[model samples]
Target: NYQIVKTLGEGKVKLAYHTTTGQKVALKIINKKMQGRIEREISYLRLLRHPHIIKLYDVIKSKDEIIMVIEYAGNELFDYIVQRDKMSEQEARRFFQQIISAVEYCHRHKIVHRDLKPENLLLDEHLNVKIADFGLSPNYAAPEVISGKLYAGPEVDVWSCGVILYVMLCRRLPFDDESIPVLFKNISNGVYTLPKFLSPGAAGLIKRMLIVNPLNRISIHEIMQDDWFKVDLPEYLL
Candidate 1:
């Protein structure tokens, strides 16, 4: 049996730990609260098997609490970006590549992250990406999520990716307001400012990804083919 040694981090719905075996694990201890979402997350974790995605080792039910064992990594990308304010294009692209690769893989498996942001993107000792929080909601959630309108799943994820890419490049959110209602309003209107000095290539990618018309936005395959993404990629990687 695994032992919970020390708490690594605490989230709204989960608690993480640094284990004795040099392994870090997260536990989402739910006590009979809304279970449908929890159940869906568990199934998604089980179905997902990708290098950049979090791994699920086991599950244990004790009394009223359902504990899910999930892979844990170092500090979140959110924290890293906060410390540095913003990252250079080369550095941000590396992490963004990993994020897109992981998201593309998820779409291939008929899954949409729905919620994607820096906080959910974990990094290892080397800063490689390990996407966590597969099926969470609000805040960074896609517009379709709040609209309750039928939407293409992949498009929703791409929109959030645009938001994340903007954050990495500028250390600021495209859509931000003191009020949640206003934030959602800004998001719905696709109103977010870009830095004046943003590289043209990066600017193009973000513009299409954050399009208010989901159908008008670029596809993951198209994003992978873009010059900005293709540049500096190894011959084998391309």
Candidate 2:
């Protein structure tokens, strides 16, 4: 049996302890109003099995609530980036490599994480990546999505990954504005600047991923072959 110990973050998540093995886990509670979203998330989590993805252990359902037992990771990548300001290219690359590897695995299984952002990326005790939140909650919008154009699944994910990579290395979003319309316009046009300090390889890769046209965007296969992404890549991920 799992016992809830304390609430974590917003009330949507709680920290729990397993009585059998004293294992710590996260209990994600969802309202029945969002039943369709939670069910889709559960299906994807169950289908995906990768080192960098969050693990779903069990599910308990009630008339008005759905509680998911999940692997507990106490740190959010958003906080990690904020606390550190900006990370060195080497460190950013390490984290980016893990993220891309996990994303590639997802695409291989024909799953698209429509919502990919630092907040959804968790860090375990060992600082390993554990991607969470697969409920189509939009945080980073791809150009096609913002333009209301039909897009193939993987391309949108690639665009979000580019935004994530930019955030990691620059400590700021590539596209932002006070007005929602302006922000959407910037995203639609793929208007963002790369810091001059970025290495050529990094800048080039970002440019390719952030292309406004999905047909012209760099693919996961191409990204894997890029020299910058290939550096220090773990054999296991390849």
Candidate 3:
């Protein structure tokens, strides 16, 4: 029911267009070697249904490949932020609200998106956020994940969301280093500074989420109730 188009992008996957509908869809062609991660992602995609999350439309399998038909969103949030640099608090809050809502829904359903980053977030034609790539990231890794400590599911995602929120407002990573060891050290230590330009509310929220101790990290529930997060929150998300 779909026709192959020229490749949109490649990372062990491809995309195509529906023959009759002319709609675009992502085709995640799986490699047998990476079957474990693919299976995990497919399960989460199948279980999750949210406005801000990517939609899985269908799946087909062959001897050598498993193809997943996913809803297509053409723009990446990473590029969106890069092209525009930093965004105003109002705009940043809008995107953050949507992200938090989606994350909250996932946590409620007992799923943890170990990876949450701008690169995994897609912008639809309407410019609404559509989260893709359910599996997992190191840069946004939680302290426990970096320290090799076993963690309860949700806190790690909350930590990554903090990093993503920082990037949105600051236009740069909160913890960055040329050396991998140093970078991991900083993440594990929760060593990062907020810019003076950030509002107290935003900074406070970041501090809470980026806490080195997962037990102390701000949760999705608390974040939703935050004064900054609640500002201009759409009724549907609430």
Candidate 4:
């Protein structure tokens, strides 16, 4: 029989264990307060199955707990960056490509990962990206998401993905301020500064994605064709 051995990752509320069958899984135990979010997450997971997306193995409901058995990553990409400080442009490209592919698949399926921050992106031992925690909120959310202008769609995710990419290259957030209003203002204006060392090619891609107008933002397919993404990218990534 599989037994719950120990907790694996950063989230205290979400406990995880390695099964006796040699499968490592996470158990997200939520209270009744999360009834709606829980249901939405399950539905999203059911609709998505991709190599770069976390796998939901099963769901279990108890008297006061809704436990989700999901694919386990070593930890979050945010923590990964915290420990390593930063990633090289080459390394960032690999991870970014994987994340983009996962997001593209979600869009094709009519699902939007409203929250696309590093915290929601997970890494396996090899540093491959596995997007996790669907249908949640993050401080580094898209402008439309911040203002509640959009519910869910491909554009919102495209903007958030740009933020994640910015963090990956510079090891810092493009838009940041202690005041929420200030931060929202910057994001709403698509105001962000690229590091001096950042390549123009990379900056160009981020520019297109982070467009303030959702309609003007780059589409996933368009990004796939962008010069920055096209150069030396693995054939399978596109």
Query: What TM-score would each prediction reach against the true structure?
Result: 0.84, 0.91, 0.90, 0.86
TM-score computed on alpha carbons, candidate 4: 0.86
- Across 1-238, the per-residue lDDT of candidate 4 in tens digits comes to 1457665443233545555567677777666655677688888887898989988888888787677788777778888787896788888888888998999998889777777776678898777789887856244677777775565467888888888888888888888988978887888887888777879999889888888878888999999888788766887765
lDDT by residue (174-204, candidate 2, tens digit) is 8988888878888988888899999999999
TM-score for candidate 3, residues paired by index: 0.90
How many clashes does the backbone of model 4 have? Answer: 0
For 35-103, candidate 3 gives per-residue lDDT tens digits of 677778788889988899998888898787788899889899888999995799999999899899999
Backbone clash pairs for candidate 2 read none
What's every prediction's RMSD, in angstroms? 3.3, 2.1, 2.2, 2.9
Clashing pairs in 4: none
Q: lDDT of each prediction vs. the true structure?
A: 0.79, 0.86, 0.85, 0.79
lDDT of 1: 0.79
lDDT of 2 at 223: 98
Ranking by lDDT: 2, 3, 1, 4
Indicate the TM-score of model 2. Answer: 0.91
Which stretches in model 4 have alpha-carbon errors above 4 Å? 8-21, 31-33, 62-65, 136-139, 150-152
